[PDB]
Amino acid sequence: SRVAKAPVVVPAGVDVKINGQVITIKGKNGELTRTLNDAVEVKLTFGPRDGYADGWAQAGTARALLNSMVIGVTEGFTKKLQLVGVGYRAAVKGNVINLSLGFSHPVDHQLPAGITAECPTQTEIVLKGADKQVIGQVAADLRAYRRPEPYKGKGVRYADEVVRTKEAKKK
Amino acid sequence: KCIRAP
Amino acid sequence: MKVRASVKKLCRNCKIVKRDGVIRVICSAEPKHKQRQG
Amino acid sequence: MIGLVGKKVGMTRIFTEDGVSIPVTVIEVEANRVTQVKDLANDGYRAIQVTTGAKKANRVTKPEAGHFAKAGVEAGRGLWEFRLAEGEEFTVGQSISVELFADVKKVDVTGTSKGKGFAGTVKRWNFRTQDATHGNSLSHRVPGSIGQNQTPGKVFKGKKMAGQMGNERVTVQSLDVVRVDAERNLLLVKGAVPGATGSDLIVKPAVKA
Amino acid sequence: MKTFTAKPETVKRDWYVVDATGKTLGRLATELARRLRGKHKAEYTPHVDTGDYIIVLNADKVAVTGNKRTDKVYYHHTGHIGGIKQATFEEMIARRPERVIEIAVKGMLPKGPLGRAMFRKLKVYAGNEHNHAAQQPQVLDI
RNA sequence: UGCUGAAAGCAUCUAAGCACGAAACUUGCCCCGAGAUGAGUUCUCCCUGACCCUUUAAGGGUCCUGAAGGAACGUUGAAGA
RNA sequence: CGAUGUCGGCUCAUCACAUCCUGGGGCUGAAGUAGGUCCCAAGGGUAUGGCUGUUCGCCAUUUAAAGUGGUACGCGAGCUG
RNA sequence: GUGAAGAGGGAAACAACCCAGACCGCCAGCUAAGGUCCCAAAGUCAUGGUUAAGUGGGAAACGAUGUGGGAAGGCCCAGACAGUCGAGUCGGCCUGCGCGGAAGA
Ligand SMILES: [K+]
Ligand SMILES: [K+]
Ligand SMILES: [K+]
Ligand SMILES: [K+]
Ligand SMILES: [K+]
Ligand SMILES: [K+]
Ligand SMILES: [K+]
Ligand SMILES: [K+]
Ligand SMILES: [K+]
Ligand SMILES: [K+]
Ligand SMILES: [K+]
Ligand SMILES: [K+]
Ligand SMILES: [Mg+2]
Ligand SMILES: [Mg+2]
Ligand SMILES: [Mg+2]
Ligand SMILES: [Mg+2]
Ligand SMILES: [Mg+2]
Ligand SMILES: [Mg+2]
Ligand SMILES: [Mg+2]
Ligand SMILES: [Mg+2]
Ligand SMILES: [Mg+2]
Ligand SMILES: [Mg+2]
Ligand SMILES: [Mg+2]
Ligand SMILES: [Mg+2]
Ligand SMILES: [Mg+2]
Ligand SMILES: [Mg+2]
Ligand SMILES: [Mg+2]
Ligand SMILES: [Mg+2]
Ligand SMILES: [Mg+2]
Ligand SMILES: [Mg+2]
Ligand SMILES: [Mg+2]
Ligand SMILES: [Mg+2]
Ligand SMILES: [Mg+2]
């Protein structure tokens, strides 16, 4: 609605190919692709196609996705995670983040195609990529290994988290 | 024995 | 998770959402307010 | 991989130097001769047929003989098939020897169990006997109730009852290979395997890893 | 004058080939059932199989509406106590896609010897090829 | 439990899309299994003679022939009422 | 009512799930260990004795656990009495 | 009122419900209840709506930004409502159809 009725300005060094519903934004950082919903019509302006009930809702999604595809190729996305807890280290080797998270085994998260990662500190992971959905998924997967506990905040958190703690009862 | 005895 | 026939906003922070076809309450503030089966 | 067909010679033991007695079944595995190679084109699956041992020339029928003549092998006492895995390749006429198992730690052994004939539920199913005494009338080893009442008013399929026991294909899995003697055509496996002395055994590398 | 009766020894039966791709399962099956029984012929006779042979291609691409692809369940019982087994539509398509059409059509044919005989004239295939070029099937748009 | 995500400028695991998730389910393991009448496949073996008649047809006889194999009988079995 | 053998035990079960154990989860007045409570889950497992006709129960000692029900208060043309 | 003492058709099957009262024959026709995609006779009929739950094809208090319709109201280009901004927005009422509540051998 309001989101769909608000066009995506493509900047310089970006190119688009509308093969029906299929779209391919491509710039410096990479080449992203999406097949849009059949109810959406793109031109970047997004609008509902007639003979579909949920046209405006579907348009507003398609808008938001192609806006992130634009940020994908121009700027790229960055997600930062930090490892709170004694002995909790991290390190990268090619496309494999090796975490020590207080387990008896080593955790070695294989990164997907687009995403790279860097550990500026032992207690920080800074993954980067074009696809906003994919960085989000990698970050969630890393967080899942040792989610922040509510007593001392120990675990993998997003840098951005307010990790509510609580006291361990009276007595 | 009696079927259905008393 | 509270599983109940009656689900209701408890907090001002509680939000009603329908996921699949189940009414749920999600509260950012208090996880005691998380509910389903509305 | 493939397995081989052998004969149960009997059981013995191997004393180890460190004191242990290992009970072994001695399996005679003479050469398995490839008699046919099933292809994915002609047959729809990949396999080898093998023969082992020897049959009397007069007791091998003309159909049987012609099948062996095509292979170019001597008639054996039977024919068995082994599914080929991806990458395994064999030729018709190839003799496969017990050396196949030289670096195999565990095998599964398949044979026909000894035949107990018609067995009661005590033996066949480990039913509990009823009272020897305390008034039991003619119902010492009999199976007891075989169902409920009007609901369901029938006996359920698979109900455990008396019947033929043994004399059927059994596989014992994951038997340690104790020794492979290529010179004597022997395979020693730890522990008992199905069947009487003299009976045929199929030995395959263990499917559980 | 007695009413005409078809005679099995003189019944003319033609071959047809249908493409199930994208067709709604039940709306295809009724048309198959009709033609296998011979309800489309003037010579229709309840006790005689007057229908046609029908090859059905692309059974794996048959369509269903709603959430039937996940939620339509095929039950069967094995005969053993506790032996109630089930498969969703999508499972049935993956494993054994020709059964989907066949089960639909069989439910719509007369029960009894003649209904079983009528079913034998349906030749369902998962893909786009059949081995029946000898019978020279004509294309049927249903 | 999530990711991305509008409808609803926010938020939202869901509507479009994507991921994870249990001794349950489908497999994987073992056994039966083509009467699976939808009766499947592969390999090998065997038979390569004449005549007559009638209602002339997937017709019935006659003489010659008798295979591959099977069964039967016998000696039997760690197979078996 | 021209007879549908009637408690309990034994033998043999089979199903439901409102789950006793084992498996997966959410909340906790969840530090940990251990609990509470609710959700998913029926694959498999789920004592032996003393007392009593007992069902049940109490008790002893175990166990991962000693589930709750339906099946003519499952089962006497199967046994007991 | 029907059954009893009543057949036929419908309600899957079903004395007592719905339609309807069998003198006999017909390989004629029209209708009742009830029906018309296939089993199975007849509309894959027409036009306009609604529902997305297989609801239809079992159930309550009560719960809920499901979705359709209606009548009003507060606030708003002296810029609302949601996070400068630029058009609708908020919450109640009456109603249609759905959703949860919903465990058994
Ligand atoms: K007695
Ligand atoms: K066959
Ligand atoms: K009586
Ligand atoms: K818990
Ligand atoms: K269970
Ligand atoms: K029971
Ligand atoms: K009774
Ligand atoms: K009794
Ligand atoms: K009886
Ligand atoms: K008896
Ligand atoms: K009357
Ligand atoms: K329904
Ligand atoms: Mg024997
Ligand atoms: Mg005993
Ligand atoms: Mg006596
Ligand atoms: Mg005795
Ligand atoms: Mg019955
Ligand atoms: Mg009928
Ligand atoms: Mg958003
Ligand atoms: Mg009587
Ligand atoms: Mg439950
Ligand atoms: Mg089950
Ligand atoms: Mg009883
Ligand atoms: Mg007796
Ligand atoms: Mg009885
Ligand atoms: Mg007495
Ligand atoms: Mg009377
Ligand atoms: Mg009547
Ligand atoms: Mg009737
Ligand atoms: Mg009329
Ligand atoms: Mg009709
Ligand atoms: Mg219903
Ligand atoms: Mg309701």
From Swiss-Prot, chain A:
The keyword Acetylation applies. The keyword DNA damage does not apply. GO terms for biological process: cytoplasmic translation; response to antibiotic; ribosomal large subunit assembly. It comes from the Bacteria. The modification N6-acetyllysine is found at residue 43. PROSITE patterns: RIBOSOMAL_L6_1 (PS00525). InterPro entries: Ribosomal_uL6-like (IPR000702), Ribosomal_uL6-like_a/b-dom_sf (IPR036789), Ribosomal_uL6_a/b-dom (IPR020040), Ribosomal_uL6_bac-type (IPR019906), Ribosomal_uL6_CS (IPR002358). SUPFAM superfamilies: Ribosomal protein L6. GO terms for molecular function: large ribosomal subunit rRNA binding; structural constituent of ribosome. GO terms for cellular component: cytoplasm; cytosol; cytosolic large ribosomal subunit. Keywords: Acetylation, Antibiotic resistance, Ribonucleoprotein, Ribosomal protein, RNA-binding, rRNA-binding. PANTHER family: 60S/50S RIBOSOMAL PROTEIN L6/L9 (PTHR11655), LARGE RIBOSOMAL SUBUNIT PROTEIN UL6M (PTHR11655:SF14). HAMAP family: Ribosomal_uL6_B. Belongs to the universal ribosomal protein uL6 family. Part of the 50S ribosomal subunit. This protein binds directly to at least 2 domains of the 23S ribosomal RNA, thus is important in its secondary structure. It is located near the subunit interface in the base of the L7/L12 stalk, and near the tRNA binding site of the peptidyltransferase center. This is Large ribosomal subunit protein uL6. It comes from Escherichia coli (strain K12).
From Swiss-Prot, chain C:
The keyword tRNA-binding does not apply. It holds the Pfam family Ribosomal_L36. It comes from the Bacteria. GO terms for biological process: cytoplasmic translation; translation. GO terms for molecular function: rRNA binding; structural constituent of ribosome. Keywords: Ribonucleoprotein, Ribosomal protein, RNA-binding, rRNA-binding. GO terms for cellular component: cytoplasm; cytosolic large ribosomal subunit. One of the last ribosomal proteins to be assembled in the 50S subunit, it contacts a number of helices in the 23S rRNA, acting as molecular glue. The simultaneous presence of uL16 and bL36 probably triggers ObgE's GTPase activity and eventual dissociation from the mature 50S ribosomal subunit. Belongs to the bacterial ribosomal protein bL36 family. Part of the 50S ribosomal subunit. PANTHER family: 50S RIBOSOMAL PROTEIN L36, CHLOROPLASTIC, LARGE RIBOSOMAL SUBUNIT PROTEIN BL36C. This is Large ribosomal subunit protein bL36A.
UniProtKB/Swiss-Prot annotation, chain E:
One of its GO terms (molecular function) is mRNA 5'-UTR binding. Keywords: Ribonucleoprotein, Ribosomal protein. The keyword Ribosomal protein applies. Pfam families: Ribosomal_L13. One of its GO terms (biological process) is negative regulation of translation. InterPro entries: Ribosomal_uL13 (IPR005822), Ribosomal_uL13_bac-type (IPR005823), Ribosomal_uL13_CS (IPR023563), Ribosomal_uL13_sf (IPR036899). One of its GO terms (cellular component) is cytoplasm. Part of the 50S ribosomal subunit. This protein is one of the early assembly proteins of the 50S ribosomal subunit, although it is not seen to bind rRNA by itself. It is important during the early stages of 50S assembly. Belongs to the universal ribosomal protein uL13 family. This is Large ribosomal subunit protein uL13. It comes from Escherichia coli (strain K12).
